[PDB]
Design a protein around this ligand. Structure first.
Ligand SMILES: NC(=O)c1ccc[n+]([C@@H]2O[C@H](COP(=O)([O-])OP(=O)(O)OC[C@H]3O[C@@H](n4cnc5c(N)ncnc54)[C@H](O)[C@@H]3O)[C@@H](O)[C@H]2O)c1
Ligand SMILES: NC(=O)c1ccc[n+]([C@@H]2O[C@H](COP(=O)([O-])OP(=O)(O)OC[C@H]3O[C@@H](n4cnc5c(N)ncnc54)[C@H](O)[C@@H]3O)[C@@H](O)[C@H]2O)c1
Ligand SMILES: [Ca+2]
Ligand SMILES: [Ca+2]
Lengths: 411, 410
């Protein structure tokens, strides 16, 4: 028992504002002492994404697909406002959207529950993991206003040169609005792969929601694919594990979700993902207890982070010079969740267990009362919380450290 | 003991299976004792709908227009197995379907809340009234699979001969899928009118939710036509009553809805309303604690029912002679909401007083501790619920009957 390590490689992406300052402590205090895995490092501080024309970003994305596991701190996705603050060049796109794209596959959000920390939905006793397809659909579609009377028609035009296929969609007598969207069989099939794979690892059952009732052909295509794919390559594997796949009309699924105790992976389409994920986020409690994880369709490759932002407001009090109480846990979990993936590919039970023992030690700490402002507010309530109801970011980490070292001995 | 009577008229639409049995009970015990109402009765039982050949259903809908208010008992929609059981001549369309067509307007699901009945969401203290926009987004869209590589295009082809405008949406390479969809300015302008009408009438605020961050023109047109109407007709009136309107990203609204004490109307688009309504209504408890209410855009014609069906599972036990404990408040509250409209239109304040007392007393009765089998299940278990904890349908109604008199004190 000293420093244990493992000979694959983590790929660290460094990120900015408050999350950045926590990254730096997490590492020093809770991971580097007891683990020394070799690390290809990158630095996606917006500081540097302007200094490198958003090109450490794309370097780092492929950096992961090579090595198989990544940790990302949260980063600033530029608004137009953001440009004036730091620096000009292009008002850049979101690193998350870039890496997600380069790696293929799908992001899965996971709450982290404690017993003293209540939820808003009384029935939820277990984690509901939403996985979001994040491509096509309403998000890359053409929209338009209609001011004349006229027709809105659609044309499919064969590439080989066959019959344009034409559909009268509607004839406007006054004014209105109009829109078209696509999706591709490849992006869906990859969503499906990534999902089936994700539920299978974590030993949970799997729902996908559509509205094929209404959209017989478009939503059907999704249903029909997961149906196609489940029975080809996974059903047998599911039964062996003892889990399942089912499909639901979205309206069931949200009823089910609400009324069910939890413990499942929920495939959502791109818009159902944006919409539901905010509900869960608020509902489970603090966004500071949630981890995004990015899985590839081959299942063998991953990039995990927190599911919150950089915490700008807190960062401002860091600069003011003031004390702060940011939840480092999603971020700490980020590390453990990753490291645990690197452990299960290296056949490494020393590190694997340390990732369990740290996650257990964090939960047992919160459950014994030592927690942060945000979680104090989950138990008590925003207006009714006071200083000696929580710890600052520093004290939490040094509280979980000391608790950790004692449980490292007794074994 | 004078008994309140009325001046204008009220349309009773009568229903099917268990709720028809409960409907009769409420007029016998809770209504015709305490108030006299000129009623136009149309019976919309499945049998009668068959005999007349859906003729009464239409008959009834026009009546509502003429008079300005409808109360509706739950009615069976004809599907396959229903034609065999009922020996139907022709699988008649849904009656609400038929009715909502003729009247027009927008439905609002309002839930009934009781101190002692916990919700699934801890933060909810007051109602959250979703208004869904029926007219098709997705629900009137065209969709088809792409097999060949090729190109999805869109044309707007002006009816005045002018030069069309194309839009290349996508070039497929493998196969995929394509959808095109629409909405009218007028359909949205009537969704709006109705929501503003409703929110003012209730004295609640109104959130409109859309995704105009992405659908800048499409979901834009919703945001726009609302605020056009807001600060032309309604902003003076809402501020007087101490309410407001505001737009929000659909992302806010679900998160707000969750964090929020509540007490507002939420208008949302067809799809956004369909999906939420079914989690929302699960969160609040039994289905017997919610009312539906169509309100046309002027705000003068209205038609109100329970937000639940005919509860057939229990109608089989009523047939067999076993005790039943269907919950009646939704059904009752359809009567009180409908009369409450009838009353507000007749500037008729003695009836308005009744509609209030009955609503308040029904809550009192449950709050106190007499309830139906669902509400004991909410409070106590599913297990650990014994017979002393719930009244049967009849003996519950008759339990508020008493307490109504006890508070028939003005
Ligand atoms: N990489 C990512 O996961 C990600 C996701 C969304 C937004 N962002 C970015 O984050 C920045 C800030 O945006 P935001 O307003 O959504 O902020 P945020 O998501 O960091 O936090 C939202 C609010 O919730 C609270 N909160 C969230 N996480 C917390 C934690 N761990 N501990 C304590 N409190 C917490 C904060 O008080 C904050 O005001 C933006 O520049 C945006 O581009 C990043
Ligand atoms: N007129 C309408 O607005 C309307 C709406 C929905 C369904 N229906 C009709 O009713 C029939 C059956 O519908 P369904 O069974 O799908 O839904 P339902 O509302 O009849 O009942 C479904 C379940 O909900 C429960 N439920 C509903 N109201 C209840 C109450 N007051 N107390 C206790 N439990 C209650 C029942 O226990 C039942 O198991 C169908 O033939 C349909 O056409 C009519
Ligand atoms: Ca969102
Ligand atoms: Ca629904």
């Amino acid at each position: 028992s000293n420093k244990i390590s493992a000979t694959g490689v983590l790929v660290e992406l460094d990120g900015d504002e408050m999350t950045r300052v926590i990254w730096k402590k997490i590492k020093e205090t809770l991971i580097f002492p007891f683990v020394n895995v070799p690390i290809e490092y990158y630095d996606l501080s917006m500081e540097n994404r302007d200094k490198t024309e958003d090109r450490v970003t794309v370097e780092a994305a492929y950096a992961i697909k090579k090595h198989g596991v990544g940790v990302k701190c949260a980063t600033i996705t530029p608004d137009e406002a953001r440009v004036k603050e730091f620096n000009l060049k292009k008002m850049w796109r979101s690193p998350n959207g870039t890496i997600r794209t380069i790696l293929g596959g799908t992001v899965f959000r996971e709450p982290i529950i404690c017993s003293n920390v209540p939820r808003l939905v009384t029935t939820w006793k277990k984690p509901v993991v939403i996985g979001r397809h994040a491509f096509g659909d309403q998000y890359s579609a053409t929209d338009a206003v209609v001011k004349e009377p006229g027709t809105f028609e659609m044309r499919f035009i064969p590439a080989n040169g066959g019959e344009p296929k034409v559909y009268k969609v509607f004839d406007y007598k006054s004014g209105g609005v109009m829109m078209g969207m696509y999706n591709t069989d490849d992006s869906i099939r990859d969503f499906a792969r990534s999902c089936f794979e994700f539920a299978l690892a974590r030993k949970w059952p799997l729902y996908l929601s559509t509205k094929n009732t209404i959209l017989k052909h478009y939503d059907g295509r999704f249903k029909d694919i997961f149906a196609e794919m489940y029975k080809a390559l996974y059903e047998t594997k599911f039964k062996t594990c003892g889990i399942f796949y089912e499909h639901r009309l979205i309206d069931d699924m949200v009823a089910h979700c609400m009324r069910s105790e939890g413990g499942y992976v929920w495939a959502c389409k791109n818009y159902d993902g944006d919409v539901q994920s905010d509900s869960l986020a608020q509902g489970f409690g603090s966004l500071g207890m949630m981890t995004s994880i990015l899985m590839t369709p081959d299942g063998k490759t991953v990039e995990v982070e927190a599911a919150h932002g950089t915490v700008t407001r807190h960062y401002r009090d860091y600069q003011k010079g003031k004390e702060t109480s940011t939840n480092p846990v999603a971020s700490i979990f980020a590390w453990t969740r990753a490291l645990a993936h690197r452990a299960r590919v290296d056949n490494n039970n020393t590190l694997l267990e340390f990732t369990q023992r740290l996650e257990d030690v964090i939960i047992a700490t919160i459950e014994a009362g030592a927690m942060t402002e945000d979680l104090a507010i989950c138990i008590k309530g925003e207006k009714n919380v006071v200083r000696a109801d929580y710890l600052n970011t520093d004290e939490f980490i040094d509280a979980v450290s000391q608790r950790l070292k004692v449980a490292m001995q007794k074994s």
